[PDB]
Amino acid sequence: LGFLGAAGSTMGAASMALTVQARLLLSGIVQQQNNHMLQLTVWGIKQLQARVLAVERYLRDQQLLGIWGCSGKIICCTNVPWNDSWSNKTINEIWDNMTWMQWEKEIDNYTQHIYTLLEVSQIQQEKNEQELLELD
Amino acid sequence: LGFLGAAGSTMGAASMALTVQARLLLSGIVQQQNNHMLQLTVWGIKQLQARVLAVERYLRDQQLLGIWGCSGKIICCTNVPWNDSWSNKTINEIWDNMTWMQWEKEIDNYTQHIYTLLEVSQIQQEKNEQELLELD
Amino acid sequence: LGFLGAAGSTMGAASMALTVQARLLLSGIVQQQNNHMLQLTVWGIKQLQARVLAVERYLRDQQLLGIWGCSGKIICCTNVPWNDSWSNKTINEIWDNMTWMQWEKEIDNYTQHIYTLLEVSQIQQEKNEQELLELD
Amino acid sequence: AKKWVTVYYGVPVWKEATTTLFCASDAKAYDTEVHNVWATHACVPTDPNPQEIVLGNVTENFNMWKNNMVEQMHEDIISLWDQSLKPCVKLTPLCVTLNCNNVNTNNTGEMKNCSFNVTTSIRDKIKKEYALFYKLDVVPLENITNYRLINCNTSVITQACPKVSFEPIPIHYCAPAGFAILKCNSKTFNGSGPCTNVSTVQCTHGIRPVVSTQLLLNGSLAEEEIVIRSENITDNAKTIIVQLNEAVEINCTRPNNNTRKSIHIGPGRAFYATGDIIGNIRQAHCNISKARWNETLGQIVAKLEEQFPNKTIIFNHSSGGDPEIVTHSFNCGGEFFYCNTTPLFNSTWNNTGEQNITLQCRIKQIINMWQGVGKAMYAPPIRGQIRCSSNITGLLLTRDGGRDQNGTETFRPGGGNMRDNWRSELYKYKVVKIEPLGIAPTACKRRV
Amino acid sequence: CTRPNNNTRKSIHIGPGRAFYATGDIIGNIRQAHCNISKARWNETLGQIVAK
Amino acid sequence: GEMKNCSFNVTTSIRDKIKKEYALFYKLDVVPLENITNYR
Ligand SMILES: *[C@@H]1O[C@H](CO)[C@@H](O[C@@H]2O[C@H](CO)[C@@H](O[C@@H]3O[C@H](CO[C@H]4O[C@H](CO[C@H]5O[C@H](CO)[C@@H](O)[C@H](O)[C@@H]5O)[C@@H](O)[C@H](O)[C@@H]4O)[C@@H](O)[C@H](O[C@H]4O[C@H](CO)[C@@H](O)[C@H](O)[C@@H]4O)[C@@H]3O)[C@H](O)[C@H]2NC(C)=O)[C@H](O)[C@H]1NC(C)=O
Ligand SMILES: *[C@@H]1O[C@H](CO)[C@@H](O[C@@H]2O[C@H](CO)[C@@H](O[C@@H]3O[C@H](CO)[C@@H](O)[C@H](O[C@H]4O[C@H](CO)[C@@H](O)[C@H](O)[C@@H]4O)[C@@H]3O)[C@H](O)[C@H]2NC(C)=O)[C@H](O)[C@H]1NC(C)=O
Ligand SMILES: *[C@@H]1O[C@H](CO)[C@@H](O[C@@H]2O[C@H](CO)[C@@H](O[C@@H]3O[C@H](CO)[C@@H](O)[C@H](O)[C@@H]3O)[C@H](O)[C@H]2NC(C)=O)[C@H](O)[C@H]1NC(C)=O
Ligand SMILES: *[C@@H]1O[C@H](CO)[C@@H](O[C@@H]2O[C@H](CO)[C@@H](O[C@@H]3O[C@H](CO)[C@@H](O)[C@H](O)[C@@H]3O)[C@H](O)[C@H]2NC(C)=O)[C@H](O)[C@H]1NC(C)=O
Ligand SMILES: *[C@@H]1O[C@H](CO)[C@@H](O[C@@H]2O[C@H](CO)[C@@H](O[C@@H]3O[C@H](CO)[C@@H](O)[C@H](O)[C@@H]3O)[C@H](O)[C@H]2NC(C)=O)[C@H](O)[C@H]1NC(C)=O
Ligand SMILES: *[C@@H]1O[C@H](CO)[C@@H](O[C@@H]2O[C@H](CO)[C@@H](O[C@@H]3O[C@H](CO)[C@@H](O)[C@H](O)[C@@H]3O)[C@H](O)[C@H]2NC(C)=O)[C@H](O)[C@H]1NC(C)=O
Ligand SMILES: *[C@@H]1O[C@H](CO)[C@@H](O[C@@H]2O[C@H](CO)[C@@H](O[C@@H]3O[C@H](CO)[C@@H](O)[C@H](O)[C@@H]3O)[C@H](O)[C@H]2NC(C)=O)[C@H](O)[C@H]1NC(C)=O
Ligand SMILES: *[C@@H]1O[C@H](CO)[C@@H](O[C@@H]2O[C@H](CO)[C@@H](O[C@@H]3O[C@H](CO)[C@@H](O)[C@H](O)[C@@H]3O)[C@H](O)[C@H]2NC(C)=O)[C@H](O)[C@H]1NC(C)=O
Ligand SMILES: *[C@@H]1O[C@H](CO)[C@@H](O[C@@H]2O[C@H](CO)[C@@H](O[C@@H]3O[C@H](CO)[C@@H](O)[C@H](O)[C@@H]3O)[C@H](O)[C@H]2NC(C)=O)[C@H](O)[C@H]1NC(C)=O
Ligand SMILES: *[C@@H]1O[C@H](CO)[C@@H](O[C@@H]2O[C@H](CO)[C@@H](O[C@@H]3O[C@H](CO)[C@@H](O)[C@H](O)[C@@H]3O)[C@H](O)[C@H]2NC(C)=O)[C@H](O)[C@H]1NC(C)=O
Ligand SMILES: *[C@@H]1O[C@H](CO)[C@@H](O[C@@H]2O[C@H](CO)[C@@H](O[C@@H]3O[C@H](CO)[C@@H](O)[C@H](O)[C@@H]3O)[C@H](O)[C@H]2NC(C)=O)[C@H](O)[C@H]1NC(C)=O
Ligand SMILES: *[C@@H]1O[C@H](CO)[C@@H](O[C@@H]2O[C@H](CO)[C@@H](O)[C@H](O)[C@H]2NC(C)=O)[C@H](O)[C@H]1NC(C)=O
Ligand SMILES: *[C@@H]1O[C@H](CO)[C@@H](O[C@@H]2O[C@H](CO)[C@@H](O)[C@H](O)[C@H]2NC(C)=O)[C@H](O)[C@H]1NC(C)=O
Ligand SMILES: *[C@@H]1O[C@H](CO)[C@@H](O[C@@H]2O[C@H](CO)[C@@H](O)[C@H](O)[C@H]2NC(C)=O)[C@H](O)[C@H]1NC(C)=O
Ligand SMILES: *[C@@H]1O[C@H](CO)[C@@H](O[C@@H]2O[C@H](CO)[C@@H](O)[C@H](O)[C@H]2NC(C)=O)[C@H](O)[C@H]1NC(C)=O
Ligand SMILES: *[C@@H]1O[C@H](CO)[C@@H](O)[C@H](O)[C@H]1NC(C)=O
Ligand SMILES: *[C@@H]1O[C@H](CO)[C@@H](O)[C@H](O)[C@H]1NC(C)=O
Ligand SMILES: *[C@@H]1O[C@H](CO)[C@@H](O)[C@H](O)[C@H]1NC(C)=O
Fold this sequence. Notes:
Membrane topology (chains A, B, C): Single-pass type I membrane protein
Bound molecules: a molecule of 6 linked components (NAG-NAG-BMA-MAN-MAN-MAN), a molecule of 4 linked components (NAG-NAG-BMA-MAN), a molecule of 3 linked components (NAG-NAG-BMA), a molecule of 2 linked components (NAG-NAG), 2-acetamido-2-deoxy-beta-D-glucopyranose
Distance between the termini of chain A: 48 Å
Protein name (chains A, B, C): Transmembrane protein gp41
Shape of chain A: extended
Transmembrane segments (chains A, B, C): 1-18
Region (Fusion peptide) (chains A, B, C): 1-13
Radius of gyration of chain D: 26 Å
Oligomer: part of a larger assembly
Organism (chains A, B, C): Human immunodeficiency virus type 1
């Protein structure tokens, strides 16, 4: 559906196509061939410094999915309840009305407190319960 | 069985040992110690530029397995049917005859169309069906 | 519980909190903003060379979990039996007595032989059995 | 029977491609000599256990002449040669007026008692200094001989590195992660083609960076026959490299015993030149065996009878050229030796300690090797002893014009390239890109 | 944009190796560079500039 | 025109020997300081 080709469309239609937004995110139309006899020019330095910032934005979120059991797929749920105090709108309502665009501007605040809680109930509690529950 | 020590052997014996081909692929006999008082020499520049191309070849395929539910293991199947028009040879036949070597030269053409179809039936359809099917 | 805030505490209390030890391990208090008009100074070279060594230590272990079916979580068991010749102490005994600190100094020796065996019983045997067992 | 797509990672399949490589070197002198021009202070180290995995059933076609590793070695050495000596003394204001005579005895050598103007420690005060140098380093222009230096024309000269070994050590090449170097440890080679026993290595052979024309000094010696490297052969015009089966030892000395003369050019900067020669006037003196060489030539003339038509006329010496091009120009102990290739091609034959064999030896200090139109280098003299402990690891040949048919096709040494010098080392190498992702259908699928 | 100043090549070496290239000799009549432009086209472009 | 027949001292191939050379240049490239026009 195109790179960010679902950003305009509502959350429901945005969750419908979000693989392309991660597909062309790394090696798409920016990777290229990457081809006086020296490569220490202004274009050589700029491409390698940008390469470091390229992986940094991917790995930051990649590590999080890995410590949530959501690493194996694009969309995976967790065993974390939603504290009503964060957002008071209906599940189905933001999906055809608010859109991911405004929605990120709503969570961004408690987003770090959400990430903190996501680590324990789904991994620090769920995967730590396995140690005893695996053999019975 | 050795780094690429199964390339000669048929697909069946090649699928038997393919972990070593990924094990020595990154930090094996090429990583090393990585040890006038400066490290801006011709060997310093060459090692770091090669390091960028090293991860690039791994991450390109690593991202694909992550968006197929095959990230958790070396060999994992998908819910994608094989269009007979791509290849007409018997499953068991290429595994003891053709070998991965010639086989890659057969798929490489529709390989991008295969990757496009692999994303939707196994992730954009299967994992998107979960949104409603997870709680019932 | 803090970065390495469980190293002092026994293995049982160390396995209780080991997500923070991987959380602040990459982009915590070392990432920063990363902000004559040129960035080729002594601080620019030192930060990018350190960035290469930063991912190298993560990816080495990240590849191993990926080839063990343990990629999806922090703690995941395997189908590998423990050869009594390696360690003769009781399971519950090292967990409240020896601590991970001394324990790493005990396994480090057979650690490569352990990694070699971990690849085959859990992946080269278990995931290779699936090829025939998936459809029946 | 219900074909479903199965994803496989770590598939042993390669694709022909070229990537940026890096060093692999073992600890040499460690204490005494710490940084030699090639290895420098910080070189990527080598592992004592290389991946010797040999792949059966693999007949991969190797490209000898069209190998991209050869071009990588060409750019690395020159860039390093420009880097080396950059922080050293610039001889830009040194080049001045030169007035001289010959020796105290009327030629019974090739040195000239020259006088000149050099700015001492203080810029304002000027001192007239007398110093030695070898032949060809100066060119005439005008009772007294009045001439100029060869540098001023062409390039800015700089004084070379002090106490830095300009002698090679085994420099192995390591390909990065997700890439592999295909090793060809096959017996015969017909100038590129399909091999027998292709191997997979992540670390190459102990290739020493060869700095010579005419003869090859280090490296691969493929046994039982002399290997003919053919870039091109049907057409005479193109260069032909030949690998030897057994090494032909060559001694290289210089019984010219020189002292140390230091003259400061402006503030701090120190210029070191040839002092005074102690003893009798004599040539460098390389030396070689008579019969051993003849024996090596025995199979060379026999192989060319098989490659080229019948027993057609085929002998002559190096044609035209400048000193560095037509003579066996090589680094030995520090200085550059320019010995003659005339007593070799003196033998005309059709049907298939030791002996005193030497060549017209001459020394040269002004050296901007590989034609350095920017930064020129002054070779510093070596105080005392000059030893060899080197080898013959091959040679370079040429054409016989563009004669149609005929019975005359006289071959001589006219190989004027540095890339072809490492083509007797990287002949067995070809870099490949590893493709671990593989798609294969089989009767199995996934469920809910 | 033209320059009907027709100049030859004069090379003078400054010390060793280094070569300095400067204006040689102008062949023909003495004249200005001569860029040139349209009268009406510009006027037409200016028409909407003053209106805006 | 706007060109000036200038003379000057340029160190030739040899540092010791000095040769007086004549070369062309365009207007504004030089600025006055002092029978004969003397500038920098
Ligand atoms: C293929 O590659 C090889 C690479 O190994 C090429 O090898 C050639 O080897 C020879 C023979 O060794 C080189 O010449 C000499 O090497 C000497 C090694 O010295 C070491 O031990 C020293 C102890 O000193 C005492 O013994 C030495 C014996 O030579 C005496 O010279 C000395 O006066 C003492 O009595 C250490 O002090 C030293 O540092 C080493 O650890 C060197 O000693 C000798 O170097 C002199 O000059 C050096 C300049 O920096 C100086 O540092 C040394 O101290 C010393 O005074 C000298 O280099 C060849 O140079 C070398 N190169 C070539 C191209 O021939 C092989 O040739 C090459 N080519 C092929 C096969 O064709
Ligand atoms: C090494 O390089 C050589 C390059 O010469 C290469 O072999 C060449 O192949 C071409 C194929 O077209 C040969 O061309 C013809 O050969 C015939 C037979 O002798 C001639 O009669 C032809 O004459 C043509 O050219 C003349 C000169 O311009 C014209 O006047 C005339 O009208 C024709 O156009 C033409 O030469 C060529 O001869 C060979 N070279 C030989 C046989 O020496 C060879 O493949 C390479 N070898 C390897 C792989 O080592
Ligand atoms: C979370 O839900 C609560 C409770 O429903 C929201 O708090 C308050 O909700 C009342 C709803 O009756 C808001 O009153 C509104 O007043 C406006 C203006 O007079 C009127 O037009 C509406 O019809 C309604 O009566 C009240 O403003 C609101 N208070 C505030 C300041 O938050 C709560 O806002 C929801 N989510 C958030 C953003 O925290
Ligand atoms: C955190 O929740 C708050 C709750 O609304 C979100 O907005 C907050 O809004 C106020 C008022 O707009 C902010 O005040 C700011 O003052 C500066 C002064 O320079 C002004 O430039 C801004 O335009 C703004 O008026 C306040 O900072 C802001 N945050 C908090 C924590 O109270 C906010 O978006 C949520 N998310 C984040 C990222 O914190
Ligand atoms: C996909 O399967 C089809 C159908 O079986 C292949 O298409 C055609 O298959 C026939 C099989 O009878 C081929 O005929 C062959 O002719 C040769 C030469 O006369 C003969 O020796 C064989 O015994 C056979 O009779 C035919 O060539 C083939 N057509 C082409 C050009 O493809 C099809 O090729 C298979 N896979 C591919 C590569 O698409
Ligand atoms: C895509 O499927 C085709 C089907 O055979 C595979 O091969 C195709 O083969 C023809 C004929 O060999 C190719 O023509 C080429 O012409 C150039 C002209 O310079 C010549 O150098 C080549 O040797 C070749 O004769 C054609 O390009 C090629 N591809 C297509 C798309 O028709 C092909 O391997 C499959 N895979 C890929 C990577 O496309
Ligand atoms: C693995 O378990 C075995 C067998 O229990 C350990 O091997 C040996 O175990 C005996 C236990 O009776 C040790 O004897 C000890 O002698 C000391 C000093 O006289 C005494 O204080 C103890 O009460 C006990 O009787 C013996 O030293 C030990 N042998 C060695 C050298 O290993 C084995 O050590 C265990 N794990 C290891 C580290 O391999
Ligand atoms: C491998 O298992 C051994 C079994 O104890 C662990 O220790 C071994 O201990 C001996 C004696 O302490 C080591 O000898 C060493 O000699 C050097 C000489 O310079 C000295 O500096 C050391 O302090 C030490 O005495 C021995 O090397 C060592 N290893 C082996 C393989 O026998 C060892 O920690 C285990 N782990 C590893 C990483 O190998
Ligand atoms: C070229 O060779 C000549 C050899 O004639 C070198 O210069 C000459 O050096 C000698 C001794 O070093 C000078 O003779 C003595 O000088 C002392 C002290 O000044 C005086 O007390 C003695 O009575 C005697 O005159 C000799 O005069 C000198 N030549 C001249 C005319 O100055 C010269 O350095 C060599 N340099 C090169 C390689 O061009
Ligand atoms: C190294 O030596 C081998 C063995 O001689 C070379 O193989 C030869 O390759 C050429 C083309 O590169 C073949 O020429 C053609 O053969 C066909 C067969 O039908 C014929 O119809 C043509 O008129 C032409 O003669 C040649 O046959 C073949 N060897 C034989 C059996 O004679 C190989 O290319 C060599 N490497 C190089 C490029 O120097
Ligand atoms: C400035 O313009 C003057 C033009 O007067 C340029 O210098 C003059 O060049 C001419 C010819 O190139 C010299 O005349 C002839 O010299 C030859 C050989 O030396 C002689 O055989 C003839 O009889 C005749 O004298 C002329 O003397 C010379 N002017 C002087 C006084 O030396 C000058 O090069 C221009 N340079 C700039 C742009 O400043
Ligand atoms: C170094 O400078 C001195 C300065 O005296 C030179 O001596 C003069 O040389 C020129 C010709 O080159 C003669 O015309 C003078 O008559 C000399 N003077 C004396 C003292 O006789 C000296 O030759 C210069 N050396 C060089 C070659 O640079
Ligand atoms: C070419 O085939 C030969 C055998 O036919 C391989 O030769 C052996 O290589 C191993 C590598 O460890 C050595 O230990 C043996 O001693 C070799 N045998 C002898 C004496 O020839 C060879 O390695 C193959 N080629 C390549 C590319 O490696
Ligand atoms: C060149 O030959 C001379 C002649 O022997 C050597 O000179 C000796 O050098 C040593 C070094 O300390 C002195 O102790 C001797 O007294 C010298 N002898 C004499 C009479 O000169 C010189 O060593 C030789 N070459 C080099 C550069 O070592
Ligand atoms: C280049 O150097 C020469 C050296 O002779 C200059 O000629 C002298 O110029 C000065 C004034 O600039 C006069 O006082 C002398 O009388 C001149 N000598 C002669 C031969 O008449 C020449 O002018 C210099 N050129 C420049 C402009 O650098
Ligand atoms: C095996 O693969 C080769 C590759 O060309 C093919 O020619 C042969 O027919 C194949 N055999 C079968 C039918 O598996
Ligand atoms: C020396 O450099 C000059 C500068 O152009 C050149 O004319 C001359 O020919 C060079 N050397 C020779 C060939 O004598
Ligand atoms: C030249 O080198 C050979 C090889 O060591 C040696 O045997 C021979 O004696 C040397 N020459 C002399 C000085 O005799």
